[PDB]
C-alpha cells in the first residue's frame, strides 16, 4: 500500500530511512527505536542548521512518520516524530510575551496577523478569482487542494483527543460531525471535494502521497500543531483556518462557477460559506477561556507565525506550478 | 490537579511509582523512560502470575498512566502503558483460531457469548429492576455508573483515531456527536448523567479517581481495548456496549422512574433507548467487513471474552458494596 510507512521508506535513498524501517518492525527493540530517534533528531538538527539535503531528508521522513496509514506502526511512528518535533520547536522563533495580552488586544493581533498573511491575499488567489486561470491551472490548484482537505478531519480529531474538558471536546466533535458529512457519509467534505475533482477530470485518491517539498512541509507542520500537548498550537491552526475559509471559499466558489462548474459540482466550496461563521463564533470560546494564560498566548502565536511561514512557501510553490502550465 | 499523573504517583506506596515519575519528567532521558518500561512490565508479569501485591501495584500504576488528565505527559504515559499491555495480552486466553470462522459461525458465537454473560442478567441488574433497592443502594450503583460513563467518549475517540477509512471514521464521528450532545453541549451524556446524579445527593466529579480495584480493572481494560492498533479489540468492546445499552437502559430507566425521579432527570437512560438502535445497525458494517480476516476475529473475540471477565468481576464488587448497606 502506497501510503504505508514501509513502502514509502524503501523509496527514500537515505540511510536513516532504513534505520527507521528497522525501528518500525513488529519486534523492534527499545535500542533500535532510540537509535532511530537519535539519528532523526540529529538529521533534523543538521537540516535546520543549513544542510539542504538533511533538511529535505528529515522532512520526507517526517511526512512518512506522521502521516502514513498503517495503523500498526502508528504509535511508534508518532514516538519517532516527537524526536523530530522537539528539534523543530527549538529552531522555530517563539513568541515570548511574559505578560498576557488583553482579550481585545489578542483578537486585534490575530486580525492584524491575518490581514498581513492571509492566503486570500496571495497573488495566485487573486489571479484565479479574477477569472484569468486556465483549466489545467485550476487543476494544479485543486490537485493541491486535495492534499490540504482530505485528512484535515484527522488532525482535528487529534486536537479533540487533547481537550480534556468535556465541553471543549464536544465543540470539536460538532466540528468533526459537520466535516464528515453529518448523517450522510456520502457528503463528508473530503468526498465533496472528490466530486469537484472528478467534475474537472482529476482523481481523488485517499492514498495520495505528496511529492512537493513545500506541501510536505505544510502537512507535517499542521499535524505537529494539531497533535501538540500544549493545545495553543492546535487551536491556532484550527481557528485561523476556520476564520479564513468562508471568504476564501466564497471567492473560489465564484471562480469555479465562472470556470464552467455547476452549483453541485462546486458544493465543496459552497457549503463552507454558510456552515463555518456560526461554528467559528462558538469555537472562539476555546481561545477566550485560555487568553489569561501567557504560556497559551506564546504557544498560540508561535504556532500561528510558523503556520503562516509554511503556508506562504506552499502557496508560492503552487503558484509556480500554476504558471508553468 | 487531583487526577494528574505526578500528584497521583507521589501518593502510591509502590517503589516503581518513583521510576514512573522520573520517566514523565520534562527532560526525561531515553534510559529513564526505558527503565520505567522495564520495571512496569516486570511488575505486570509478577502480578498476572499470582503475586497479589504486584497485581494491585501494576493495576494502580496502569490506571495513572492510561487515564490521568495532564496531556503534557500523555504521550509518554501511553508509551509506558503499552509495555504493560503487551504483557497483559500474553496472559489473556486468546481465541486461538487457526482459520477464520464463517460469518454464520461468527455471529452465532457472538450471540452465545452475549447470551451467557450480558450485564443485564447480573443479579444486581435484576435487583435494581426489581424496585427493591434503597436510596443508599442506588447511590452505590450511580456512583460507579459515573466512572463508567463520564469519559467513555474519550475511549471512543481513540477508536475513531485508529479508523483510517474516512467513511468508518464518519461512523464513529456520528457516535461522538450524539454522545457529546449533538448541537448542545449541556446535553452531553456525561452531563445528563451528572444531572441524574445531582438528584439524590451525589457529586459528579470530572476529576474523580477510583479506589475500587475491580473498577480500575474495568476502566484499564476498556481504554486498552479502544486504543489498540488492531481495531478488533475496540470494536468488540464498542459493539457489545452499543448492542446491550438499549435494553439495559430501558429497564434501568423504568426502575429509576419507579424510584421517584422524573423522566427528564433520568434522561440519561431514556435517550439511549431510542438513540442507539438506529446507529448500531450502521456501525455493524465496520465489523462485517473484517469478519473474513482471522486476525480480526481473534482480536475481537479475545477482547470480548476479556471484557466480559472484567465486567463481571466489577459488577460483582459493586453488588457486594451495595449489599453492605
Ligand atoms: O490546508 C488547510 O488547513 C486549509 C484547508 S480548509 C478546508 C476545510 N475546512 O473546514 C483549505 O485548503 O481550504
Ligand atoms: O462503559 C460502560 O460500562 C457502558 C456505559 S454506557 C454509556 C453510553 N453512553 O452514554 C454504562 O455503564 O451504561
Ligand atoms: Fe470542511
Ligand atoms: Fe451515550
Author numbering:
A (entry chain A), B (entry chain B): 3 to 327
Sentences from the paper on this structure:
FlcD, an HDO from the opportunistic pathogen Pseudomonas aeruginosa, catalyzes the excision of an oxime carbon in the biosynthesis of the copper-containing antibiotic fluopsin C. We show that FlcD is a dioxygenase that catalyzes a four-electron oxidation. FlcD is a homodimer in each structure. Each monomer contains two domains: an N-terminal superhelical linker domain (IPR037061) and a C-terminal iron-binding domain (IPR016084). In contrast to quintessential HDOs, our data indicate that FlcD employs a mononuclear iron cofactor to catalyze a four-electron oxidation.
Structures of FlcD bound to iron and substrate show that the oxime of the substrate coordinates to the mononuclear iron. The loop that contains V278 and R281 now folds into a continuous α3 helix and closes the active site alongside folding of the α2 helix, showing that substrate binding alone can induce conformational changes in FlcD without binding a second Fe. Surprisingly, upon substrate binding, the Cα of R281 moves 10.3 Å toward the active site to place the guanidino group within hydrogen-bonding distance to E244. In turn, E244, which corresponds to the glutamate that bridges Fe1 and Fe2 in SznF, forms two hydrogen bonds with R281 instead of binding the metallocofactor. Binding of the FlcD substrate and the subsequent relocation of R281 appear to sterically occlude another iron from binding to FlcD at a similar location to the Fe2 site of SznF. The positions of the iron-binding residues, E181, H191, and H274, in both monomers of the FlcD·Fe·substrate structure are nearly identical; however, the substrate exhibits two distinct binding modes. In monomer A, the oxime C=N–O of the substrate forms a complex with Fe and completes an octahedral geometry with two waters. In monomer B, the oxime N–O conforms around the Fe in a square pyramidal geometry with one water. In both monomers, the oxime moiety of the substrate coordinates the iron, while the succinate moiety interacts with the side chains of R121, Q147, R150, Y220, R224, and H251 in both monomers. Interestingly, the oxime of the FlcD substrate binds iron in two different conformations, although it is unclear which monomer represents the productive substrate-binding mode.
